[PDB]
Amino acid sequence: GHMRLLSEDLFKQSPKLSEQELDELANNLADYLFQAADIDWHQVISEKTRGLTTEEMAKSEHRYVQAFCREILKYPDCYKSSVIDVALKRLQTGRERLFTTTDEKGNRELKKGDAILESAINAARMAISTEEKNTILSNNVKSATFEVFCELPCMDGFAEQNGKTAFYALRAGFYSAFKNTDTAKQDITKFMKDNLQAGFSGYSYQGLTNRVAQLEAQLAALSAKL
């Protein structure tokens, strides 16, 4: 995903954008949300492999399981006593325990179980299309994209700054944004654009306080003409 999406002051400068740049940013933000959305790899890999051999796993029709197992199988002492379920156990139970593989140059190499798992998972993330990932996500896409949204640098201290209540209101608005199952992209793009234009000031103490002050002035300047 683009660099501009990752600015920490994104919410600050978004309202200073042109309605052209704003549309671009919102579409890109949306695209980034779907692209980076995660799934339960521990679950979907295990489901795709349980009952199969090491070689069978190595040449599956799923490129993403192929990439996953390729990483795992480098460390025989992690699965060699299903293998996938064994490795998942041993790697997590053995996080910070050093596993052994053989380098390309024939040297010995040790790597922490947790790094091994994160790598295997990253490889699978690299080998799946957004299309298949979304099909696997189903309607949990709403929670997976929101999880990505909350990880953005611009969302860094949202809950702590604006409070639990505001944060959960934001979540509700986010979930509610998804109207039709076949307009996901279009919908969340609109929610993003509306809020980016206002810098998400609908969920902040200062944004709301300012709007109240604005309204008091607007009411005053109106009740005057009459």
Which residues of this chain interact with a second copy, rule CB under 8 A? 159-166, 169, 202-206, 208-209, 211-212, 215-216, 218-219, 222-223, 225-226
For the CB of residue 223, give the shortest distance to a second copy in the complex, in Å. Answer: 6
If the CB atoms of residues 108 and 164 are measured against a second copy, the closer one turns out to be: 164
If the CB atoms of residues 127 and 198 are measured against a second copy, the closer one turns out to be: 198
Taking the C-alpha atoms of residue 84 and residue 44, their distance in angstroms, rounded to an integer, is: 11
What is the residue whose two structure tokens read 């190499």?
109
Strand partners, 100: 110
Q: Give the pair of three-digit tokens for residue 132.
A: 């298949």
**Residue of 64, 158, 174, 200 interacting with Cl ion (CB under 5 A):** 158
For the CB of residue 207, give the shortest distance to a second copy in the complex, in Å. Answer: 9
What is the residue whose two structure tokens read 């860094």?
156
Taking the C-alpha atoms of residue 89 and residue 214, their distance in angstroms, rounded to an integer, is: 58
If the CB atoms of residues 1 and 173 are measured against Cl ion, the closer one turns out to be: 173
**Residue of 102, 165, 209, 218 interacting with Cl ion (CB under 5 A):** 102
Instruction: Quickly list DSSP for 142-183.
Output: HHHHHHHHTTSGGGTTHHHHHHHHHHHHHHHHHHHH---TT-
For the CB of residue 160, give the shortest distance to Cl ion in the complex, in Å. Answer: 7
If the CB atoms of residues 52 and 159 are measured against a second copy, the closer one turns out to be: 159
